Design a protein around this ligand. Sequence first.
Ligand SMILES: NC(=O)c1ccc[n+]([C@@H]2O[C@H](COP(=O)([O-])OP(=O)(O)OC[C@H]3O[C@@H](n4cnc5c(N)ncnc54)[C@H](OP(=O)(O)O)[C@@H]3O)[C@@H](O)[C@H]2O)c1
Length: 416
Amino acid sequence: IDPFEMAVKQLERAAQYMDISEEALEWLKKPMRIVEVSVPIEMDDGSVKVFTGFRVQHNWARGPTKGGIRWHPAETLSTVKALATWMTWKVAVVDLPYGGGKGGIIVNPKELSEREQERLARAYIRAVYDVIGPWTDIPAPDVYTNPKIMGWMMDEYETIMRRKGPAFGVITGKPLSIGGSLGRGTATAQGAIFTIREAAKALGIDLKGKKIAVQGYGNAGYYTAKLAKEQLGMTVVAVSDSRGGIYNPDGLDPDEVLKWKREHGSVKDFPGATNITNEELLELEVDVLAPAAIEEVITEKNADNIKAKIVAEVANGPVTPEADDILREKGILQIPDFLCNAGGVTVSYFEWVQNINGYYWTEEEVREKLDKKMTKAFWEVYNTHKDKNIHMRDAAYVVAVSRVYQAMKDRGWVKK
Ligand SMILES: NC(=O)c1ccc[n+]([C@@H]2O[C@H](COP(=O)([O-])OP(=O)(O)OC[C@H]3O[C@@H](n4cnc5c(N)ncnc54)[C@H](OP(=O)(O)O)[C@@H]3O)[C@@H](O)[C@H]2O)c1
Protein backbone atom coordinates (compact mmCIF):
# COMPACT_ATOMS: atom_id res chain seq x y z
CA ILE A 1 0.00 0.00 0.00
CA ASP A 2 1.15 3.56 -0.77
CA PRO A 3 1.99 4.85 2.75
CA PHE A 4 3.80 1.79 4.11
CA GLU A 5 5.65 1.29 0.82
CA MET A 6 6.67 4.96 0.89
CA ALA A 7 8.00 4.51 4.44
CA VAL A 8 9.90 1.37 3.39
CA LYS A 9 11.39 3.23 0.42
CA GLN A 10 12.48 6.06 2.72
CA LEU A 11 14.10 3.53 5.06
CA GLU A 12 15.94 1.96 2.10
CA ARG A 13 17.12 5.38 0.92
CA ALA A 14 18.40 5.89 4.45
CA ALA A 15 20.09 2.48 4.55
CA GLN A 16 22.00 2.95 1.30
CA TYR A 17 23.99 5.70 3.07
CA MET A 18 24.97 3.80 6.23
CA ASP A 19 26.40 0.41 7.18
CA ILE A 20 23.35 -1.78 7.90
CA SER A 21 23.00 -5.55 7.64
CA GLU A 22 20.37 -7.05 5.35
CA GLU A 23 18.71 -8.91 8.23
CA ALA A 24 18.36 -5.66 10.18
CA LEU A 25 16.76 -3.97 7.17
CA GLU A 26 14.26 -6.80 6.74
CA TRP A 27 13.56 -6.74 10.48
CA LEU A 28 12.85 -3.00 10.33
CA LYS A 29 10.60 -3.40 7.28
CA LYS A 30 8.20 -5.70 9.15
CA PRO A 31 6.76 -3.98 12.25
CA MET A 32 7.18 -6.00 15.44
CA ARG A 33 3.56 -5.99 16.58
CA ILE A 34 0.27 -5.19 14.86
CA VAL A 35 -2.97 -5.40 16.84
CA GLU A 36 -6.23 -5.01 14.91
CA VAL A 37 -9.21 -5.08 17.26
CA SER A 38 -12.94 -4.52 17.11
CA VAL A 39 -13.92 -1.63 19.38
CA PRO A 40 -17.61 -1.77 20.34
CA ILE A 41 -19.54 1.15 21.81
CA GLU A 42 -23.17 1.80 22.67
CA MET A 43 -24.54 4.85 20.87
CA ASP A 44 -26.96 7.31 22.42
CA ASP A 45 -29.81 5.67 20.50
CA GLY A 46 -29.00 2.37 22.21
CA SER A 47 -27.53 0.63 19.17
CA VAL A 48 -24.08 -0.94 19.38
CA LYS A 49 -21.58 0.21 16.75
CA VAL A 50 -18.26 -1.54 16.19
CA PHE A 51 -15.19 0.20 14.78
CA THR A 52 -11.80 -1.12 13.71
CA GLY A 53 -8.83 -0.06 15.84
CA PHE A 54 -5.15 -0.50 15.05
CA ARG A 55 -2.18 -0.50 17.42
CA VAL A 56 1.14 -0.87 15.60
CA GLN A 57 4.32 -1.12 17.67
CA HIS A 58 6.97 -0.84 14.97
CA ASN A 59 9.88 -1.52 17.33
CA TRP A 60 10.84 -1.48 21.00
CA ALA A 61 14.60 -2.05 20.76
CA ARG A 62 15.44 1.37 22.21
CA GLY A 63 12.66 1.23 24.80
CA PRO A 64 8.89 1.32 25.27
CA THR A 65 7.06 2.23 22.09
CA LYS A 66 5.67 5.75 21.76
CA GLY A 67 2.94 6.82 19.39
CA GLY A 68 -0.10 8.93 18.65
CA ILE A 69 -3.73 7.93 18.23
CA ARG A 70 -5.65 9.12 15.17
CA TRP A 71 -9.45 9.15 15.01
CA HIS A 72 -9.81 9.56 11.25
CA PRO A 73 -12.47 7.95 9.03
CA ALA A 74 -9.79 7.39 6.38
CA GLU A 75 -7.53 5.47 8.79
CA THR A 76 -5.95 2.35 7.31
CA LEU A 77 -3.63 -0.31 8.68
CA SER A 78 -0.94 0.72 6.19
CA THR A 79 -1.16 4.35 7.30
CA VAL A 80 -0.84 3.38 10.97
CA LYS A 81 2.13 1.11 10.22
CA ALA A 82 3.87 3.83 8.20
CA LEU A 83 3.32 6.39 10.95
CA ALA A 84 4.65 3.92 13.52
CA THR A 85 7.80 3.55 11.42
CA TRP A 86 7.84 7.36 11.33
CA MET A 87 7.64 7.64 15.12
CA THR A 88 10.47 5.13 15.47
CA TRP A 89 12.88 7.52 13.75
CA LYS A 90 11.22 10.48 15.47
CA VAL A 91 12.11 9.11 18.90
CA ALA A 92 15.47 7.79 17.67
CA VAL A 93 16.82 11.09 16.34
CA VAL A 94 16.40 12.86 19.70
CA ASP A 95 17.91 10.02 21.78
CA LEU A 96 14.75 8.98 23.45
CA PRO A 97 14.55 5.59 25.18
CA TYR A 98 11.50 4.91 23.02
CA GLY A 99 10.34 2.72 20.20
CA GLY A 100 7.86 3.65 17.51
CA GLY A 101 4.15 3.27 18.16
CA LYS A 102 0.99 4.33 16.41
CA GLY A 103 -2.65 3.98 17.32
CA GLY A 104 -5.77 4.68 15.33
CA ILE A 105 -9.46 3.98 14.93
CA ILE A 106 -11.48 3.99 11.70
CA VAL A 107 -14.01 6.54 12.94
CA ASN A 108 -15.17 10.04 12.08
CA PRO A 109 -15.50 11.88 15.44
CA LYS A 110 -17.37 14.82 13.87
CA GLU A 111 -20.78 13.25 14.57
CA LEU A 112 -19.70 11.41 17.73
CA SER A 113 -21.07 13.07 20.85
CA GLU A 114 -19.08 13.63 24.02
CA ARG A 115 -20.59 10.51 25.58
CA GLU A 116 -19.83 8.56 22.41
CA GLN A 117 -16.27 9.89 22.28
CA GLU A 118 -15.70 8.92 25.92
CA ARG A 119 -17.14 5.46 25.28
CA LEU A 120 -14.96 5.02 22.19
CA ALA A 121 -11.84 6.01 24.12
CA ARG A 122 -12.58 3.68 27.03
CA ALA A 123 -13.54 0.81 24.73
CA TYR A 124 -10.37 1.25 22.67
CA ILE A 125 -8.36 0.97 25.88
CA ARG A 126 -10.37 -2.09 26.93
CA ALA A 127 -9.53 -3.66 23.55
CA VAL A 128 -5.82 -2.78 23.41
CA TYR A 129 -4.88 -2.97 27.11
CA ASP A 130 -2.89 -6.19 26.74
CA VAL A 131 -0.54 -4.55 24.21
CA ILE A 132 -0.05 -1.17 25.92
CA GLY A 133 1.36 0.07 29.20
CA PRO A 134 3.74 2.65 30.66
CA TRP A 135 6.77 0.40 30.13
CA THR A 136 5.56 -1.09 26.83
CA ASP A 137 3.39 1.24 24.73
CA ILE A 138 2.51 4.90 25.35
CA PRO A 139 -0.29 6.48 23.29
CA ALA A 140 -0.12 10.22 22.61
CA PRO A 141 -2.43 12.86 21.10
CA ASP A 142 -2.77 13.06 17.33
CA VAL A 143 -5.20 14.25 14.64
CA TYR A 144 -8.78 14.68 15.95
CA THR A 145 -7.73 13.54 19.46
CA ASN A 146 -7.71 16.07 22.28
CA PRO A 147 -6.30 15.69 25.82
CA LYS A 148 -9.84 15.22 27.13
CA ILE A 149 -9.94 11.90 25.28
CA MET A 150 -6.62 11.07 26.92
CA GLY A 151 -7.94 11.87 30.37
CA TRP A 152 -10.72 9.41 29.57
CA MET A 153 -8.34 6.69 28.36
CA MET A 154 -5.98 7.15 31.30
CA ASP A 155 -8.98 6.77 33.60
CA GLU A 156 -9.97 3.56 31.80
CA TYR A 157 -6.44 2.13 31.95
CA GLU A 158 -6.21 2.99 35.65
CA THR A 159 -9.55 1.27 36.23
CA ILE A 160 -8.43 -1.90 34.44
CA MET A 161 -4.93 -1.98 35.97
CA ARG A 162 -6.47 -1.51 39.45
CA ARG A 163 -4.13 1.40 40.26
CA LYS A 164 -1.33 -1.18 40.65
CA GLY A 165 1.24 0.74 38.60
CA PRO A 166 2.01 4.27 37.38
CA ALA A 167 -1.23 4.76 35.47
CA PHE A 168 -0.51 8.36 34.43
CA GLY A 169 2.49 7.03 32.51
CA VAL A 170 0.49 4.76 30.20
CA ILE A 171 -0.33 7.68 27.88
CA THR A 172 0.85 11.25 27.39
CA GLY A 173 -0.73 14.56 26.51
CA LYS A 174 -2.90 14.26 29.63
CA PRO A 175 -4.50 17.34 31.22
CA LEU A 176 -2.43 19.29 33.73
CA SER A 177 -4.83 18.31 36.53
CA ILE A 178 -4.06 14.60 35.98
CA GLY A 179 -0.39 13.84 35.39
CA GLY A 180 -0.02 16.48 32.70
CA SER A 181 3.11 18.48 31.97
CA LEU A 182 3.88 22.05 31.01
CA GLY A 183 4.76 23.09 27.48
CA ARG A 184 2.70 20.43 25.70
CA GLY A 185 0.78 22.98 23.61
CA THR A 186 3.91 24.81 22.46
CA ALA A 187 6.13 21.71 22.31
CA THR A 188 6.56 21.36 18.55
CA ALA A 189 7.08 25.08 17.98
CA GLN A 190 9.60 25.31 20.82
CA GLY A 191 11.57 22.38 19.40
CA ALA A 192 11.43 23.98 15.96
CA ILE A 193 12.83 27.22 17.41
CA PHE A 194 15.60 25.25 19.11
CA THR A 195 16.47 23.65 15.76
CA ILE A 196 16.25 27.06 14.06
CA ARG A 197 18.83 28.76 16.24
CA GLU A 198 20.98 25.62 16.15
CA ALA A 199 20.89 25.82 12.35
CA ALA A 200 21.82 29.50 12.57
CA LYS A 201 24.73 28.66 14.88
CA ALA A 202 25.89 25.93 12.50
CA LEU A 203 25.76 28.37 9.57
CA GLY A 204 27.76 30.86 11.66
CA ILE A 205 25.16 33.63 11.37
CA ASP A 206 23.33 35.08 14.38
CA LEU A 207 19.58 35.78 14.43
CA LYS A 208 19.53 39.33 15.83
CA GLY A 209 16.87 41.15 13.82
CA LYS A 210 16.49 38.93 10.76
CA LYS A 211 13.47 37.66 8.86
CA ILE A 212 11.28 34.58 9.29
CA ALA A 213 8.41 33.54 7.01
CA VAL A 214 5.94 30.86 8.10
CA GLN A 215 3.49 29.24 5.67
CA GLY A 216 0.56 27.59 7.43
CA TYR A 217 -0.58 29.39 10.56
CA GLY A 218 -2.17 26.81 12.84
CA ASN A 219 -1.32 26.59 16.53
CA ALA A 220 2.15 25.28 15.70
CA GLY A 221 2.91 28.04 13.20
CA TYR A 222 1.64 30.84 15.41
CA TYR A 223 3.62 29.53 18.37
CA THR A 224 6.71 29.14 16.17
CA ALA A 225 6.50 32.76 15.05
CA LYS A 226 5.81 34.08 18.55
CA LEU A 227 8.64 32.13 20.19
CA ALA A 228 11.03 33.09 17.38
CA LYS A 229 10.23 36.76 17.92
CA GLU A 230 10.44 36.50 21.71
CA GLN A 231 13.67 34.50 21.95
CA LEU A 232 15.72 34.79 18.76
CA GLY A 233 15.11 38.52 18.30
CA MET A 234 14.06 37.83 14.72
CA THR A 235 11.44 39.84 12.85
CA VAL A 236 8.44 37.92 11.50
CA VAL A 237 7.73 39.29 8.02
CA ALA A 238 4.87 37.12 6.75
CA VAL A 239 2.22 34.76 8.12
CA SER A 240 -0.29 32.73 6.14
CA ASP A 241 -2.76 29.89 6.41
CA SER A 242 -4.03 27.68 3.60
CA ARG A 243 -6.60 30.41 2.91
CA GLY A 244 -4.57 33.60 2.56
CA GLY A 245 -1.36 35.37 3.45
CA ILE A 246 -0.02 38.57 5.00
CA TYR A 247 2.99 40.62 3.92
CA ASN A 248 4.71 43.21 6.09
CA PRO A 249 8.49 43.68 5.68
CA ASP A 250 8.48 46.29 8.48
CA GLY A 251 7.57 43.60 11.03
CA LEU A 252 4.57 41.84 12.54
CA ASP A 253 3.32 40.52 15.87
CA PRO A 254 1.85 36.99 15.93
CA ASP A 255 -0.44 37.87 18.87
CA GLU A 256 -2.41 40.53 16.99
CA VAL A 257 -2.31 38.33 13.88
CA LEU A 258 -4.03 35.49 15.75
CA LYS A 259 -6.46 37.96 17.33
CA TRP A 260 -7.39 39.30 13.88
CA LYS A 261 -7.83 35.74 12.63
CA ARG A 262 -10.11 34.91 15.57
CA GLU A 263 -12.13 38.09 15.04
CA HIS A 264 -12.56 38.05 11.24
CA GLY A 265 -12.56 34.25 10.95
CA SER A 266 -9.55 34.30 8.60
CA VAL A 267 -5.97 35.46 8.90
CA LYS A 268 -6.05 37.62 5.75
CA ASP A 269 -6.82 41.36 5.62
CA PHE A 270 -4.49 42.21 8.51
CA PRO A 271 -4.22 45.98 9.18
CA GLY A 272 -1.02 47.69 8.05
CA ALA A 273 -0.10 44.81 5.72
CA THR A 274 -0.76 43.44 2.24
CA ASN A 275 -2.90 40.41 1.42
CA ILE A 276 -0.73 37.90 -0.45
CA THR A 277 -0.82 34.33 -1.72
CA ASN A 278 0.76 31.25 -0.24
CA GLU A 279 2.63 30.30 -3.41
CA GLU A 280 4.77 33.45 -3.64
CA LEU A 281 5.31 33.27 0.12
CA LEU A 282 6.88 29.84 -0.34
CA GLU A 283 9.33 31.53 -2.74
CA LEU A 284 9.76 34.68 -0.63
CA GLU A 285 13.34 35.78 0.07
CA VAL A 286 13.78 35.55 3.85
CA ASP A 287 16.36 34.28 6.31
CA VAL A 288 14.28 31.49 7.91
CA LEU A 289 11.41 29.71 6.17
CA ALA A 290 8.98 27.37 7.97
CA PRO A 291 6.23 25.48 6.12
CA ALA A 292 3.57 24.73 8.74
CA ALA A 293 0.69 23.63 6.51
CA ILE A 294 -0.63 20.72 4.43
CA GLU A 295 2.10 18.33 3.31
CA GLU A 296 4.25 18.80 0.20
CA VAL A 297 4.10 22.55 -0.34
CA ILE A 298 7.70 22.91 -1.61
CA THR A 299 7.88 21.03 -4.90
CA GLU A 300 10.28 20.57 -7.81
CA LYS A 301 8.12 23.06 -9.71
CA ASN A 302 9.47 25.86 -7.49
CA ALA A 303 12.30 24.30 -5.46
CA ASP A 304 15.03 26.55 -6.88
CA ASN A 305 12.97 29.66 -6.03
CA ILE A 306 13.51 29.33 -2.26
CA LYS A 307 16.30 31.67 -1.14
CA ALA A 308 16.15 31.32 2.65
CA LYS A 309 19.37 29.99 4.15
CA ILE A 310 17.50 27.91 6.76
CA VAL A 311 14.37 25.88 5.96
CA ALA A 312 12.68 24.52 9.09
CA GLU A 313 10.25 21.75 8.12
CA VAL A 314 7.92 22.21 11.07
CA ALA A 315 5.18 20.30 9.26
CA ASN A 316 5.55 16.59 8.53
CA GLY A 317 6.93 16.11 5.04
CA PRO A 318 6.32 19.61 3.66
CA VAL A 319 9.14 19.18 1.11
CA THR A 320 9.33 16.46 -1.54
CA PRO A 321 12.66 14.60 -1.85
CA GLU A 322 13.45 16.21 -5.22
CA ALA A 323 12.91 19.68 -3.76
CA ASP A 324 15.04 18.60 -0.79
CA ASP A 325 17.87 17.70 -3.17
CA ILE A 326 17.44 20.93 -5.15
CA LEU A 327 17.67 22.99 -1.95
CA ARG A 328 20.69 20.93 -0.90
CA GLU A 329 22.53 21.73 -4.13
CA LYS A 330 21.58 25.39 -3.65
CA GLY A 331 23.52 25.64 -0.38
CA ILE A 332 20.26 25.76 1.60
CA LEU A 333 20.32 24.09 5.01
CA GLN A 334 17.11 22.15 5.62
CA ILE A 335 15.99 21.00 9.05
CA PRO A 336 14.38 17.60 8.36
CA ASP A 337 10.70 17.37 9.21
CA PHE A 338 10.75 14.68 11.90
CA LEU A 339 13.75 16.28 13.62
CA CYS A 340 12.17 19.74 13.49
CA ASN A 341 8.81 18.64 14.92
CA ALA A 342 10.29 16.28 17.52
CA GLY A 343 9.53 18.90 20.19
CA GLY A 344 6.08 17.45 20.77
CA VAL A 345 7.54 13.97 21.15
CA THR A 346 10.30 15.18 23.49
CA VAL A 347 7.81 17.03 25.69
CA SER A 348 5.61 13.92 25.64
CA TYR A 349 8.61 11.91 26.84
CA PHE A 350 9.13 14.49 29.57
CA GLU A 351 5.50 14.03 30.61
CA TRP A 352 6.03 10.27 30.70
CA VAL A 353 9.11 10.73 32.89
CA GLN A 354 7.18 13.03 35.22
CA ASN A 355 4.34 10.51 35.48
CA ILE A 356 6.65 7.54 36.09
CA ASN A 357 8.60 9.27 38.86
CA GLY A 358 5.59 10.91 40.50
CA TYR A 359 7.45 14.23 40.44
CA TYR A 360 6.37 17.02 38.09
CA TRP A 361 8.79 19.64 36.83
CA THR A 362 8.21 23.34 36.24
CA GLU A 363 7.89 25.03 32.86
CA GLU A 364 11.45 26.37 32.98
CA GLU A 365 12.88 22.93 33.76
CA VAL A 366 10.95 21.35 30.88
CA ARG A 367 12.07 24.12 28.52
CA GLU A 368 15.72 23.75 29.54
CA LYS A 369 15.69 19.97 29.14
CA LEU A 370 13.91 20.22 25.79
CA ASP A 371 16.47 22.78 24.63
CA LYS A 372 19.33 20.52 25.69
CA LYS A 373 17.94 17.43 23.97
CA MET A 374 17.01 19.33 20.80
CA THR A 375 20.46 20.92 20.63
CA LYS A 376 22.17 17.54 21.02
CA ALA A 377 19.96 15.90 18.39
CA PHE A 378 20.44 18.75 15.92
CA TRP A 379 24.20 18.73 16.41
CA GLU A 380 24.35 14.96 15.88
CA VAL A 381 22.39 15.34 12.65
CA TYR A 382 24.54 18.26 11.46
CA ASN A 383 27.78 16.44 12.28
CA THR A 384 26.63 13.38 10.33
CA HIS A 385 25.65 15.72 7.48
CA LYS A 386 29.15 17.21 7.46
CA ASP A 387 31.10 13.96 7.83
CA LYS A 388 29.14 11.76 5.41
CA ASN A 389 28.57 14.58 2.87
CA ILE A 390 24.90 13.61 2.60
CA HIS A 391 21.63 15.51 2.87
CA MET A 392 20.53 16.76 6.29
CA ARG A 393 17.38 14.65 6.05
CA ASP A 394 19.61 11.78 4.96
CA ALA A 395 21.83 12.47 7.98
CA ALA A 396 18.85 12.39 10.36
CA TYR A 397 17.66 9.11 8.87
CA VAL A 398 21.19 7.69 9.14
CA VAL A 399 21.59 8.62 12.81
CA ALA A 400 18.11 7.39 13.77
CA VAL A 401 18.46 4.06 11.96
CA SER A 402 21.99 3.65 13.34
CA ARG A 403 20.74 4.14 16.90
CA VAL A 404 17.89 1.67 16.38
CA TYR A 405 20.19 -0.90 14.76
CA GLN A 406 22.70 -0.51 17.61
CA ALA A 407 19.89 -1.08 20.10
CA MET A 408 18.87 -4.23 18.22
CA LYS A 409 22.44 -5.54 18.05
CA ASP A 410 22.96 -4.92 21.77
CA ARG A 411 19.63 -6.65 22.51
CA GLY A 412 20.83 -9.61 20.44
CA TRP A 413 17.91 -9.42 18.01
CA VAL A 414 20.20 -9.22 14.97
CA LYS A 415 23.54 -11.02 15.21
CA LYS A 416 25.27 -9.06 12.44
N1 LIG B 1 -0.61 16.82 24.10
C1 LIG B 1 -1.43 17.85 24.28
O1 LIG B 1 -1.72 18.25 25.39
C2 LIG B 1 -2.02 18.52 23.07
C3 LIG B 1 -3.01 19.65 23.26
C4 LIG B 1 -3.47 20.18 21.98
C5 LIG B 1 -3.02 19.67 20.77
N2 LIG B 1 -2.14 18.67 20.70
C6 LIG B 1 -1.71 18.18 19.39
O2 LIG B 1 -1.28 19.29 18.59
C7 LIG B 1 -2.12 19.47 17.45
C8 LIG B 1 -2.75 20.85 17.59
O3 LIG B 1 -4.07 20.72 18.10
P1 LIG B 1 -5.27 21.63 17.53
O4 LIG B 1 -6.38 21.66 18.54
O5 LIG B 1 -4.67 22.93 17.03
O6 LIG B 1 -5.77 20.80 16.25
P2 LIG B 1 -6.83 21.44 15.22
O7 LIG B 1 -8.17 21.52 15.90
O8 LIG B 1 -6.69 20.73 13.89
O9 LIG B 1 -6.26 22.94 15.04
C9 LIG B 1 -5.05 23.18 14.33
C10 LIG B 1 -5.16 24.52 13.62
O10 LIG B 1 -4.33 24.53 12.46
C11 LIG B 1 -5.04 25.05 11.33
N3 LIG B 1 -4.75 24.26 10.11
C12 LIG B 1 -4.96 22.94 9.95
N4 LIG B 1 -4.59 22.54 8.71
C13 LIG B 1 -4.13 23.62 8.05
C14 LIG B 1 -3.58 23.90 6.70
N5 LIG B 1 -3.44 22.92 5.78
N6 LIG B 1 -3.22 25.17 6.42
C15 LIG B 1 -3.35 26.16 7.33
N7 LIG B 1 -3.84 25.98 8.56
C16 LIG B 1 -4.24 24.75 8.98
C17 LIG B 1 -6.52 24.96 11.67
O11 LIG B 1 -7.21 26.12 11.21
P3 LIG B 1 -7.91 26.13 9.76
O12 LIG B 1 -8.77 24.89 9.78
O13 LIG B 1 -8.67 27.43 9.73
O14 LIG B 1 -6.74 26.06 8.80
C18 LIG B 1 -6.59 24.78 13.18
O15 LIG B 1 -7.10 25.94 13.84
C19 LIG B 1 -3.17 18.37 17.46
O16 LIG B 1 -3.11 17.63 16.23
C20 LIG B 1 -2.88 17.52 18.68
O17 LIG B 1 -2.54 16.17 18.35
C21 LIG B 1 -1.65 18.10 21.81
